[PDB]
Amino acid sequence: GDPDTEIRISARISNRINELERLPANLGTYSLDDCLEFITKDDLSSRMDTFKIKALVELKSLKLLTKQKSIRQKLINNVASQAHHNIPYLRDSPFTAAAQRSVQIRSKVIV
Amino acid sequence: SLPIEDNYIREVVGSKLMECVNDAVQTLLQGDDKLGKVSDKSREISEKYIEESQAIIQELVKLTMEKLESKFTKLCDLETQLEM
Amino acid sequence: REISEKYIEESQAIIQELVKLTMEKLESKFTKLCDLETQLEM
Amino acid sequence: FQCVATGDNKWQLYEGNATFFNELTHYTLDLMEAISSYIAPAMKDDHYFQTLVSILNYTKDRYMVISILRSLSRLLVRSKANEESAADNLDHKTLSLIVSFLLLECDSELIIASLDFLYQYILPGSQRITELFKSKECSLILEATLPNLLSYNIATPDYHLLQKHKFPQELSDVSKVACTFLCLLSNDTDDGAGSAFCQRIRPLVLHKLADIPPLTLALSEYMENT
Amino acid sequence: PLNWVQGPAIFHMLTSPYTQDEIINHEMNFLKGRLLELQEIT
Amino acid sequence: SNIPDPTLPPTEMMTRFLHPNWYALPTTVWLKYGNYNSWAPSFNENGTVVDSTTRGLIWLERI
Amino acid sequence: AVFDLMTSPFTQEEVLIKEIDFLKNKLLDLQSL
Amino acid sequence: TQTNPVPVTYPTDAYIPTYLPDDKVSNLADLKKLIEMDSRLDLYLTRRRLDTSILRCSITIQLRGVDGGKVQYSPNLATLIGMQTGSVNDAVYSIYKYILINNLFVTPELGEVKLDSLLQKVLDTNAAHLPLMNVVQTVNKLVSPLPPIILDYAEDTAKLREITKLALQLNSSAQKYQFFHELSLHPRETLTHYLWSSKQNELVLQGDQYFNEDAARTSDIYSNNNNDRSLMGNISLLYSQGRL
Amino acid sequence: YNNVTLKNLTAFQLLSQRENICELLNLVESTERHNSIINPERQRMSLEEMKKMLDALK
């Protein structure tokens, strides 16, 4: 709850997406470990895209946030909506076992 | 299992008594010398609730009477209305 | 306990005197009325 | 349950174990309600009849009173004409209470259930009409309630409108039960406890017959027995 | 004598309450939902 | 994609959960017949989980 | 709305007939109240 | 009132304990005498409440006393009854008794009456059989109103609720007696019962804590909670049914 | 509050179960809940109202 401090969260999330969406697409790396590989004039070293993958996992997970929310909505409301058929101490409580018995009482027939 | 907005949660947003009671009842159910000390403690408490019991019951006999006295004067009206 | 015990002991005598006296006056009003009822139905 | 329904200190029920016992005896009465018609040859000291009339003096459940009354009505179906548990085990503290439920005009299932057991009670009629017309309040409640139960929930043509200017064509469910017992009460021949009752009620029924033309087709055996 | 027959449609609802009044509306739609599919077989 | 942006007015994720530990249980049904029927069966219990005393005691310790 | 596979001395139509006899009473019981 | 009792939210006529040792109280049976005294008084009162009712211009003036207490009769309906202008309900009852004297129903056999000369005269019918519903229906037609002057040329519920509230206080002290009493009877198998049941009720109350607002929006439910094991094991089952 | 929950029933039971064990050790007082329901000045006032109802009805 508390939607005053909910805008102050999403204003920092949208701050981050608009900062990731101003980086150039041709971003490359240089580790201090490539001198053991002896890269030629055109050798295509395999450590060039170790910053470019991490900048797109970050940018795309900040857009699928309401996607895992819908799955976690469908996960929590499917494991907890029963709450008394799998949890043992709740199905072995007196009030739940009597109530699950009480809803299965068939109607009495008159004469 | 991915903490995505978990940092933004942490950015903006930065008993003992009954345990020792349950420990103590566990000690009373080891030595039966305390069970007599606990049963006799409960029995004067049982006698304490007996004095609690009839002090309510002696109020209920009184309060039944005034509500019954509301129906005596209702019944005494029928002595004259039926005889009319 | 003693102030409770003083008005727990005298009270039951005043309880069962009044309830029995209530049995007297109510049943006397009954037998007067249930016989006044029969003189109507005639 | 007879330990608690009487309040016997034999088997003082622990107060922590009462909820386990409450729903337990709820389904027991439902089993007793269904098999009561198969022990319809009820015995004189029928332990099911003896306990249930001790249970009936205790409860305040509207459902439980109905299930006891339906079992006792369906236990005394093909009883006798002389001697079964109906003629003697009704201790008149229970019997004055069943007629007392006809004063409950708000409920109507309890009126039908109290009428149906007494109809199953009245069917010998020898030691039954005299027993039902015995006391100064059991033979006196029926002089006011049973004529009033004929026009129960029936659209009588009113006259307050006709006094302040300045026909139902039907019956109800309990009125069909009310004329059924009263016509069998008119079959109390030789002027016993029923026809002597049925002669002091005929001046009151005749006013009800003019407002409801379905009360002319009904109460036919009563009008033949006056 | 064996007859491998299909079992009846048992109204097993996902959310499980305990009061009856939250069950009858879905059960009446179940009775409409089951007898209408059963009437066309006849 | 067909995903919405996470700066949407749905960002709530807990609105209509209603755990079955907060479900209403059927309790005893105290009836009323009239003002002068004190010999009526005062309540009704078909499939109630509790008795009328503790349901009255819960009513007593709440009212 | 869960079905089952089971053994019965009745065939499939008599179970459907017994479903007709059971559901019509429950339809008349629930629509009346 | 209804055809069914009216449910209420306050308790109605709570019970009285009987396992209480009555040697100490000695007033439960005397209070029990008051209740059956009051109910019998309520029985007689409710029975009594049921049994107390069981150019030349003309002068036209609409009077003040135009009332349906003495309502006018048709002259056919007048001579079959005898009275001049009595009432409408007495007109129905005297008509119904006149058929019942002449025994016209049968000797619908009871609906159809044998139409005599006067009954055919007052209804202007000529059938032999006619139902009594249509007979009494014309009595609503055959009666005309009276003509005007023409000149030409509680506390008991709250007392019950307080008694219901005070009886609930009695049920508390009786149960509080017997627990310690049966703990004085057996201190073993009510404290072993206590140390299990209070542990069980500690489990049941601690079954609803991982379902808050910011408890689920964070990831300390799914990640590393194999010690929890409760969820993230159903994903092999919920996906197998399509629940996602 | 007019209804009870499974949370409400267990909290009602556990609070009532822990207070009776809290009386044997007597680490709670429970003296306010005793004397206010005893109320011995009301108990004699109950007696004096019963005493006058002897005098009024005789």
Annotated domain spans of chain I: 2-58
Question: In whole angstroms, what separates CA A7 from the centre of its chain?
Answer: 20
Residues of C in contact with B79 (CB under 8 A): 29, 32-33, 36
Query: Considering its fold, how many domains does chain B have in total?
Result: 1
Which residues lie closer than 8 Å to A50 by C-beta, 6 or more apart?
A29, A31
Does G2 contact chain E (CB < 8 Å)?
Answer: yes
Chain F CA closest to residue D59: F41
Rounded CA separation A72/C14 (Å): 70
Q: Which residue has the tokens 């300390």?
A: H220
CB contact under 8 Å between A9 and B4, yes or no, is no
Pick from D153, D159, D162, D150: nearest CA to D206: D150
Q: Is H202 on the interface with A (CB under 8 A)?
A: no
| H233: three-class secondary structure by DSSP | coil
Mutate to test the interface with I, among A93, A95, A100, A102 (most CBs of I within 10 A): A95
Q: Which of A70, H212, H226 is nearest to B13 (CA)?
A: H212
Closest CA to E18 of D61, H212, A105, G25: A105
Q: Do I43 and C25 touch (CB under 8 A)?
A: no
Burial of D118 (0-12, 13-18, 19+ CB in 10 A): buried
Chain A neighbors of D116, CB-CB under 8 A: none
Hunting for tokens 């000291």 — which residue is that? D45
Q: Residue H154: which H helix or E strand, with range?
A: none
Judged by DSSP in three states, D97 sits in helix
| B:C CB pairs within 8 Å | 37
Q: Which are the contacts of H63, defined by CB distance < 8 A and separation ≥ 6? A: H148, H149
Measured distance CA(B45)–CA(H178) in Å, rounded: 10
Dihedral sign for Cα C31, C36, C37, C41, please. positive
Q: Which residues of A touch I10 (CB under 8 A)?
A: 93, 95
**Position D18, amino acid:** A
Q: Would you state the structure tokens that stand for residue D40, as one six-digit string?
A: 């319809």
C-alpha gyration radius of chain D: 20
Tokens 């309510």 belong to residue: B56
B74 Cβ neighbours under 8 A, 6+ residues apart: H45
Q: Do chains I and G have 3 or more beta-carbon pairs under 8 angstroms?
A: no
For residues I40 and I38, what is the distance between their CA atoms, to the nearest angstrom? 6
- Residue B5 maps to a domain: no
Nearest CA in chain I to H208: I7
Question: Which chains does F contact via 3+ CB–CB distances below 8 A?
Answer: A, D, E, H, I
- CA–CA min distance E18, chain A (Å): 6
B2 with A68: Cβ contact below 8 A = yes
Does the beta-carbon distance from G2 to E9 stay under 8 Å? yes
Judged by CB atoms closer than 8 Å, whether chains meet at D200 and C34 is answered as no
Question: What one-letter code names the amino acid at B68?
Answer: L
Q: Do H6 and F43 touch (CB under 8 A)?
A: no
- C-alpha distance from residue D60 to each of D57, D72, F58 (Å): 9, 18, 19
Q: Among D49, D101, D100, D99, which residue's Cα sits nearest to residue D79?
A: D49
For residue B37, give its domain range: 15-84
β-bridge mates for residue E4, sequence order: G7
Cα separation, D65 vs F41, in Å, equals 8
Distance CA H38, CA F29 (A): 24
Cβ-based contacts of A78 with chain H (< 8 Å): 234, 238, 243
Strand partners, E10: G2
Q: Which residues of I touch C8 (CB under 8 A)?
A: 43
Domain for residue B9, yes or no? no
Q: Is H117 on the interface with C (CB under 8 A)?
A: no
CB-closest option in F33, F36, F60 to H5:
F33
49-68 in A: which are within 8 Å (CB) of B? 61-62, 65, 68
CA distance to D131, D210, D215, per residue, from D185 (Å): 13, 22, 17
Give strand pairing partners of G6. E5
- Chain B touches chain C, with at least 3 Cβ pairs below 8 Å, answer yes
The whole-angstrom separation of Cα H13 and Cα F39 is: 10
Q: Do F13 and A10 touch (CB under 8 A)?
A: no
Query: Whole-angstrom Cα distance, residue D151 to residue D158?
Result: 13
Pairs of residues, one from chain B and one from chain H, whose beta carbons lie less than 8 Å apart:
130
Q: E with G: how many residue pairs have Cβ under 8 Å apart? A: 66
CB atoms closer than 10 angstroms to residue H82: 9
Indicate if the alpha-carbon torsion angle E16, E17, E18, E24 is positive or negative: negative
Q: Which amino acid is residue A37, in one-letter code?
A: E
Inspect the interface and report whether the beta carbons of C36 and B68 lie closer than 8 Å. no
D91: Cβ contacts below 8 Å, ≥ 6 apart? D53
3-state SS of chain F: helix, strand, coil percent to 5?
A: 15, 10, 75
In this complex, the residue of H27, H37, H44 whose CB is nearest that of residue C22 is: H37
Number of Cβ within a 10 Å radius of residue H10: 15
Q: D212 vs chain H: nearest CA distance in angstroms?
A: 9
D136 CB-near residues (< 8 Å, 6+ apart): C34
Neighbours of A84 (CB within 10 A): 21
DSSP state of D61: B
**Of A5, A8, A13, which is closest to B5 when you measure between CB atoms?**
A13
| CA dihedral sign, ordered D137, D138, D141, D147 | negative
Q: Does E14 sit within 8 Å of A84, measured CB to CB?
A: no
Chain D residues whose CB is inside 8 A of the A99 CB are: none
Instruction: Tell me if D68 sits within 8 A of D55, measured CB to CB.
Output: yes
Establish, for the pair of chains H and I, how many residue pairs have beta carbons separated by less than 8 Å: 29
Alpha helices in chain A (DSSP H): 4-20, 54-61, 65-79, 88-91, 94-102
I9 touching A, CB under 8 A? yes
The answer to whether A90 contacts H235, with C-beta atoms less than 8 Å apart, is no
Amino acid in the structure at residue H44 = Y
Structure tokens at D120: 């199953």
Chain I residue with the nearest C-alpha to that of F55: I4
What tokens were used for H82?
Answer: 């005898």
Q: Measure in Å the smallest separation between the Cα of B81 and chain C Cα atoms.
A: 11
The single-letter DSSP state of residue D100 is G
Tokens 């309520």 appear where?
H42
Token pair 């396992």: residue: H19
Token pair 């008991």: residue:
H156
Our CA-based measurement puts residue H188 at a distance from the nearest CA of chain F, in whole angstroms, of 26
User: Which of I4, I8, I10, I33 is the best residue to mutate to test the H interface, defined by the most H CB atoms within 10 Å of its own CB?
Assistant: I10
H185: nearest Cα among B35, D82, C18: B35
Q: Point out which residues pair with G7 in neighbouring strands.
A: E4
Residue B50 counted as domain residue: yes
Nearest CB to B53; choose among H170, H195, H198: H170
Instruction: Please give the DSSP secondary-structure letter assigned to residue A108.
Output: P
